[PDB]
Amino acid sequence: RQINTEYAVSLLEQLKLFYEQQLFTDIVLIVEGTEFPCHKMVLATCSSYFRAMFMSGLSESKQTHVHLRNVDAATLQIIITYAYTGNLAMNDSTVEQLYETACFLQVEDVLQRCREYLIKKINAENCVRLLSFADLFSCEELKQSAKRMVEHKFTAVYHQDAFMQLSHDLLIDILSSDNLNVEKEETVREAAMLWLEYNTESRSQYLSSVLSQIRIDALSEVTQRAWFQGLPPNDKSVVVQGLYKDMPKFFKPRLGMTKEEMMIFIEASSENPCSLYSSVCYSPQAEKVYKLCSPPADLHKVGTVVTPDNDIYIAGGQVPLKFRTVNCFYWFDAQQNTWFPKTPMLFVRIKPSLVCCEGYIYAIGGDSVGGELNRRTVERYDTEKDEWTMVSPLPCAWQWSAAVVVHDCIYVMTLNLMYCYFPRSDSWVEMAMRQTSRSFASAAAFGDKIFYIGGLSSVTVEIYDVNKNEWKMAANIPAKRYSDPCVRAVVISNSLCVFMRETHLNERAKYVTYQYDLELDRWSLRQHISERVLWDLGRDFRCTVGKLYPSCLEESPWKPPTYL
Amino acid sequence: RQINTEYAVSLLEQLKLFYEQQLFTDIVLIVEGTEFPCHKMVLATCSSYFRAMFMSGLSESKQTHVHLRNVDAATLQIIITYAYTGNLAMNDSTVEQLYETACFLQVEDVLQRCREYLIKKINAENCVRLLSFADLFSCEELKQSAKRMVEHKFTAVYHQDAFMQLSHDLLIDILSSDNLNVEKEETVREAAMLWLEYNTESRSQYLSSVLSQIRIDALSEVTQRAWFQGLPPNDKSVVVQGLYKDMPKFFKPRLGMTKEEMMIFIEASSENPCSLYSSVCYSPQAEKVYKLCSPPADLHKVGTVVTPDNDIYIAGGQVPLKFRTVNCFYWFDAQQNTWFPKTPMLFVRIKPSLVCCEGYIYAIGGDSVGGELNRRTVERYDTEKDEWTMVSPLPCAWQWSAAVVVHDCIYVMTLNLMYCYFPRSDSWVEMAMRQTSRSFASAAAFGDKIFYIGGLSVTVEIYDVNKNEWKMAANIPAKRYSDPCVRAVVISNSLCVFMRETHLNERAKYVTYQYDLELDRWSLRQHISERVLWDLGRDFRCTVGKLYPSCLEESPWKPPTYLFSTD
């Protein structure tokens, strides 16, 4: 027999009614002059510290006045409020002080909630501060989560003041870890140089430990440029996933050095009978296909986005109704190969046009909810504040639209029109209209030209100029006649390309990528996507450009060759 | 924001864990030598007594040992268990002492739970004791319920020892009530006499108050026996619903002198658009139809059963899908026209064959065929223990079977076979088979003769309990080219059949016939016109019982004549 529930919820609120009117007050806690009368029974059930001080049978259990030092009055009131109600009202301003008060009082409930709250709030401005906070209080869960964040953005957080004030042990494990996301070893060297000169009188004795952690005789990728680039086409990538593997871990190339630009395909068909919307990526350099996990747990019709800072996110989508639309939002971990969750959106969405502009992520379109109220729903997200905010909606409600960013400007395109959003003005300005009405097309950005390619699709290519505000035809995608190419515009190696999947009559899917000539207005054959890999991915697949860790992701083509 | 629930239950289970190991025990209650360590806060939050004792700021809030007298140790332990858990384990053996202990500590929750438990547990044995208990402890709801129960079965409970030990106020408030279910005032007179002679030395001064409450010059239904019975056919019931109403309440005929034998029709198709599955009753002596609020949960497919003590019950059936089958058991209050639910059945049933045998009501079949041993199950209810007991199940799975009781024996009939059950042996015995295989037939018990009438084609088949032989009697006079529908019921100590016949291009006709057992002939008894009656459908269940028309219900719902023969 389980204990009563409606009686427990009534006994708890009856205790609060007595606490507010100060009945049965047997102990008075004195903290920096402020008095807080409470019950010895309630504090023991919530905090094990009071349970130990009251059950000891000493004068602390007999004296009504107990002086608690090094405890904030504001945090103590929150602990007592949680002891009589059970709801913890945490905020990013007083979470670090509440955790210090909770661990000093050893509250299993508050410590667990404050721990998971800090983990899901690790950004790029508090990573270093929370790392020293975790080491000071010995939180192995927060320390590991904060350390991985430092390793992911080490080249961007080593300028903060919190980095030069780190302890000696907090430095020896960061520099020795091979997860530093750095393109060159000089960045790690200079990061160690600025740390020792911050406080020379106290760190002059640690000069030997600093140089012993920075790899100087490593010579990761400066050796390949020395001899030559002579290899099969762009096989410098095979060395990245080979030499880096077998090494004494003292001269290993750091994880940042181990990076490869891969065409990220999300919601693709699965070779094995499974979640029909799988996620795999292809490396144009190593010509290899690596598999990606889907913690989204069968998300469908989702959007993609890649920031200039090489960050990957997904938003919106639909999950199978135990299909229902949700407002989920997940960030991909380039090292752990997962999909952590982040502050959800305000409105549920399906395939929103996610774009990054001036560090902000914008969710455009995405399954219009409430046609009577508004259909052109759009909202922005703050990377650090971790909050969502509504903005000026689209001037009209459209479907299957695309969104791009050029020169800190948000461009949304539709059937034949285009509107430009200015975050500095929070308004929409109609731009030059398109000559052809096309839908379901692909959009890309390169330099000062916006490309709206594909659409009904066709091989028609439109080149728009931001400086001239003109739409003009340049060329047609060279494809075989009577074919059905589902094209996707992608920019790689500082050059616009088209990932064209061609399916012909009675023929299987053929993948191939071409390179466009900007000066000659021509399309050159860049690379044929080997059919010994990259199985059929369907047509509704989403694609984007990003860099991932060949060193560590999930190398599994699983495509049996020697066929027919 | 609402108060958290999981944190509340976690705190409660942690407090229970601390109480089991005796942590932070600040008060020690001493009851008849037994010690109980406990917390003052829990006793204050639960009981208003301890709250007032602790918030007074006297030595009671400072002294750790508090001596509580006139409190049972087991009841105090149960109260503490409820305070630390929230569940109350009540039983019919220690409910009164628990209620007494609760009324001393004013545990609102425990008081209300014990009150409603005592209310739902008034049977035909504890009524007087519970009435005295409620009078001593001033519980108005329990007092009123026990008073109504005593008024319902006064002639059956005035022999109990608890009735002679009642106080003066209880006697003068029971005897003065016009709800005494007694057929003659001599019963109440003898009850008052035995009450006053039970303890003469203490009640010799109350003889005047005793004699002032018994109606002597009433002469309710003897005056009609003096002059004559000369009236329209059996119009004595008219005198009942007229003289009894307008009366100074001192010479009022008691409620027991008002009950009339009426044909109880349940699930009778109704013209009412909202309740088309209502129930109405017809009085053959009054030639009048009365409305019933029978459906307690707007359900149907429930059986009927009338004990020889004139008690109505319905069980089984299914409520519309909010058609989920249920187990609720409802007893009809003939005075308030409202059904009080009872202990639900163990297995759900649809139109169960409910019959009264040796004071027990047996549920026989009445369910869709599911499982060999899972179906054919028979279960009986205990009127006083308020529990269901399983018995020997049916030998074979049957459909549209009837059940009767003769000489305290159970009989169920089927297509062509027949099985007799004996509660003393708890076994099934196949009896004399019938020459015809029929279904949907109606059966009624009249003496040592079982009458199996129906078939869906009518033939009157007589079975002899003493001879175990089936003999043919007759065929119910009716019409083939039309629509027949018979309901065999025994009323006025005579077998009858209420036959509903729908003729070609004509509405349903109603008429009651009387059968002669000796001459083996069916005689026309009384034609039931549609003056206050209407189409009652075909799936309606029928039975015979005595009810008070005085305060049952008054609604014609049918204009007598409607002939626009003006032309």
Q: What is the DSSP string of A296-325?
A: TSS-BS---EE-TT--EEEE--EE----EE
Contacts of A9 in chain B (CB under 8 A): 3-5, 8-9
Contacts of B24 in chain A (CB under 8 A): 40-41, 44, 54-55
Contact A86 B24 (CB under 8 A): no
Question: How many residue pairs from chains A and B have C-beta atoms closer than 8 A?
Answer: 87
**Chain A contact present for B55, CB below 8 A:** yes
Selecting from A12, A39, A86 the residue whose C-beta is nearest the C-beta of B41 gives: A39
Show Cβ contacts of residue A356 under 8 Å, excluding neighbours closer than 6 positions.
A305, A306, A307, A308, A311, A362, A405
Show Cβ contacts of residue A369 under 8 Å, excluding neighbours closer than 6 positions.
A325, A347, A348, A377
Retrieve residue A463's tokens.
């080149």
Contacts of A11 in chain B (CB under 8 A): 8, 12, 45-46, 86
- Return the residue in B13, B17, B41 with the most chain A beta carbons within 10 A, the one to mutate for interface testing: B41
Determine the Cα–Cα distance for residues B210 and B265; give it in Å rounded to an integer: 42
Selecting from B11, B24, B46 the residue whose C-beta is nearest the C-beta of A40 gives: B24
**Chain A contact present for B41, CB below 8 A:** yes
Determine the Cα–Cα distance for residues B461 and B449; give it in Å rounded to an integer: 10
**Chain A contact present for B227, CB below 8 A:** no
The total number of residues written for chain A in this structure: 564
Determine the Cα–Cα distance for residues A253 and A238; give it in Å rounded to an integer: 14
- Strand, helix or coil for residue B462: strand
Selecting from B15, B46, B86 the residue whose C-beta is nearest the C-beta of A45 gives: B15
Contacts of B14 in chain A (CB under 8 A): 45
Neighbours of B503 (CB within 10 A): 12
Determine the Cα–Cα distance for residues B397 and B369; give it in Å rounded to an integer: 7
Handedness of CA B226, B230, B232, B233 (dihedral sign): positive
Determine the Cα–Cα distance for residues B38 and B54; give it in Å rounded to an integer: 13
Show Cβ contacts of residue B88 under 8 Å, excluding neighbours closer than 6 positions.
B78, B82, B110, B113, B114
Q: Looking at chain B from residue 424 to 443, which residues have their Cβ under 8 Å from any Cβ of chain A?
A: none
β-pair type (A65-67, A27-31): parallel
**Shortest Cα distance, chain A CAs vs residue B42, angstroms:** 9
Contact B45 A8 (CB under 8 A): no
How is the beta sheet containing B353-357 ordered, strand by strand? B353-357, B360-364, B378-381, B388-391
Tokens 């229902």 belong to residue? A324
Neighbours of A481 (CB within 10 A): 5
**Shortest Cα distance, chain A CAs vs residue B45, angstroms:** 7
**Chain A contact present for B3, CB below 8 A:** yes
**Shortest Cα distance, chain B CAs vs residue A111, angstroms:** 15
**Shortest Cα distance, chain A CAs vs residue B555, angstroms:** 44
Show Cβ contacts of residue B97 under 8 Å, excluding neighbours closer than 6 positions.
B72, B74, B75
- CA geometry: angle A385, A388, A394, nearest 5 deg: 135
Tokens 């998300």 belong to residue? A299
User: Do the Cβ atoms of B508 and B535 come closer than 8 Å?
Assistant: yes
User: Do the Cβ atoms of A113 and A119 come closer than 8 Å?
Assistant: no
Retrieve residue B278's tokens.
């209502």
Selecting from B7, B44, B85 the residue whose C-beta is nearest the C-beta of A86 gives: B7
**Shortest Cα distance, chain B CAs vs residue A9, angstroms:** 5
Determine the Cα–Cα distance for residues A2 and A22; give it in Å rounded to an integer: 32
Selecting from A9, A24, A55 the residue whose C-beta is nearest the C-beta of B3 gives: A9
Q: Which residue of A has its CA nearest to B38?
A: A41
Retrieve residue B364's tokens.
């026989």
**Chain B contact present for A45, CB below 8 A:** yes
Contact A3 B16 (CB under 8 A): yes
Handedness of CA B84, B87, B88, B91 (dihedral sign): negative
Tokens 């090494």 belong to residue? A247
- Rounded to the nearest 5°, which phi and psi values hold at B445? -95, 125
**Chain A contact present for B17, CB below 8 A:** no
Contacts of A109 in chain B (CB under 8 A): 7
Identify any residues that bridge with A362 across adjacent strands, giving them in sequence order.
Answer: A355, A380
**Chain A contact present for B1, CB below 8 A:** yes
Determine the Cα–Cα distance for residues A489 and A473; give it in Å rounded to an integer: 16
Q: How many CA atoms lie within 13 A of A131 on its CB side?
A: 28
User: Do the Cβ atoms of B157 and B124 come closer than 8 Å?
Assistant: yes
Retrieve residue A296's tokens.
């989204």
β-pair type (A288-292, A278-283): antiparallel
Determine the Cα–Cα distance for residues B52 and A11; give it in Å rounded to an integer: 17
Residue A553 identity: L
Contacts of A6 in chain B (CB under 8 A): 86
Contact A24 B18 (CB under 8 A): no
β-pair type (B65-67, B27-31): parallel
Retrieve residue A5's tokens.
């529930």
Q: How many CA atoms lie within 13 A of A308 on its CB side?
A: 13
Retrieve residue B470's tokens.
């089936």
Determine the Cα–Cα distance for residues B371 and B377; give it in Å rounded to an integer: 10
**Chain B contact present for A507, CB below 8 A:** no
Determine the Cα–Cα distance for residues A197 and B357; give it in Å rounded to an integer: 103
Determine the Cα–Cα distance for residues B529 and A198; give it in Å rounded to an integer: 112
Determine the Cα–Cα distance for residues B383 and B123; give it in Å rounded to an integer: 7
Contacts of B23 in chain A (CB under 8 A): 44, 55
Strands (E), B43-95: 65-67
Q: Would you tell me the crossing angle of helices A169-176 and A140-152 to the nearest 10 degrees? A: 50
Resolution number, Å = 4.6
- CA geometry: angle A296, A299, A304, nearest 5 deg: 85
Identify any residues that bridge with A461 across adjacent strands, giving them in sequence order.
Answer: A453
> Could you tell me how far CA B244 lies from the centroid of its own chain?
25
Contacts of A23 in chain B (CB under 8 A): 55
Q: Which residue of A has its CA nearest to B25?
A: A41
Determine the Cα–Cα distance for residues B164 and B168; give it in Å rounded to an integer: 10
Determine the Cα–Cα distance for residues A39 and A1; give it in Å rounded to an integer: 30
User: Do the Cβ atoms of B158 and B128 come closer than 8 Å?
Assistant: no
Identify any residues that bridge with A30 across adjacent strands, giving them in sequence order.
Answer: A35, A67
Q: What's A209-235 look like in SS3?
A: HHHCCCCCCCCCCCCHHHHCCCCCCCC
- Strand, helix or coil for residue B540: coil
